[PDB]
Amino acid sequence: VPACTVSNTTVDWQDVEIQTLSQNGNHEKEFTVNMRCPYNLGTMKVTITATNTYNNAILVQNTSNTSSDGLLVYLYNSNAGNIGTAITLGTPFTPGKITGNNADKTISLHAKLGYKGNMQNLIAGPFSATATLVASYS
């Protein structure tokens, strides 16, 4: 069936003090993703992938003195506004919070910031990373 057409979006943490980061991930942030799903019978399956990763987290480039270390973005499903089970990159999951009775659908997800390597090697300054999100019903 036709896959949904996902609208680009951005999750912005603004200022994040390095000293306050938890290696396991904190600074929890909820965000939404809007999409157009002409075919919406059955259940929606979403798969999120990224080019730079580490143990199921998105590895943010240029955020550590050691190029293979750095800031980490962990993604989680949502359960009625509450953080849900962690998302395994590259595998399908059904969003726990979906809104929109028509072809216009909106899902809610959660993200946390963590880091790889020593906190002292983290580099201050603007950071950016991206992930691909595909969604389709079945």
Binding site: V11, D12, Q14, A124, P126, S128, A131, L133
Partner: peptide, 11 residues
Amino acid sequence: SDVAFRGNLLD
């Protein structure tokens, strides 16, 4: 599509 994650790490 894509989801961008951004921010500013401060010392």
